[PDB]
Amino acid sequence: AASGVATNTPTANDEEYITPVTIGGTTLNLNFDTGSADLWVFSTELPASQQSGHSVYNPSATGKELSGYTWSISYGDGSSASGNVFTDSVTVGGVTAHGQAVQAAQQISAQFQQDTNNDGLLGLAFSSINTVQPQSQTTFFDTVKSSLAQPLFAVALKHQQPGVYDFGFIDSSKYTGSLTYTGVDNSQGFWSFNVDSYTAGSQSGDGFSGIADTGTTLLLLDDSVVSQYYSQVSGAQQDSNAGGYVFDCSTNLPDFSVSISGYTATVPGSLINYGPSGDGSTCLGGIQSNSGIGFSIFGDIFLKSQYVVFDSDGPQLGFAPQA
């Protein structure tokens, strides 16, 4: 049976987490994203000027082209990418997927062109939302799941320290106590779950649903919840230069918790201080608006507090406080 551990590393301020992945012999630094299902990489088919500052895949060297197949994706922050497709060998933490679909980028939006921290994305959402046409392809996880000791992956994202992606096994030394599991609704291809209630410092409210997303930097909630939270932060104000609510870096922030199938997941106020707003001398809050989409995005700010198991059996998500 196979299992493996891939180490992730946060970029400045934990904006994103990157992990090495070997494709046809070349290692690339990718952003593992539980919110999408495409494995796409910077390639030699992009303009030379866009290949600069990146490790790129050269499909002609080892890939098998899928003639006439294309991909096109648009993300929540407005970024997008598109290209063609090849199959190749993909290795993550010693687990190798043979004939894994690799989406070679032919076009990338400015957000990707400016980000030299990653060389593409490895999607870990359900394969049902893979964008390849005419026939969608499976994610790296779906491709190898039948070969793992257990059909699950687990993650520990940390604040300014290396973390891990465990494939096919659970490392009990990464959390305190026992895991609590909750059912996942994968109807929209996400690892979506329900929370029965929330507590924002001194205020508590009714439940809602959200997705566990390693590919989103913040914890994005409904505007009502954001308001409630910041009403308790002295001097918090919105700053469009920073991207949302900001406050004095020294401010004592209230904690945020959600009740999940009887387990209380708490994000300590210290983790809600994302870092320098980069707009003078305030800090950006880890909690921001979900722009009215109707569901919450449990991004990295939230994940930094837990060890989370993404189990394809159910499917379900297990949670426990990080050790």
Binding site: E16, T34, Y75, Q111, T217, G243, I297
Partner: peptide
């Protein structure tokens, strides 16, 4: 930050 980003929002995948």
């Amino acid at each position: 930050x980003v929002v995948x």
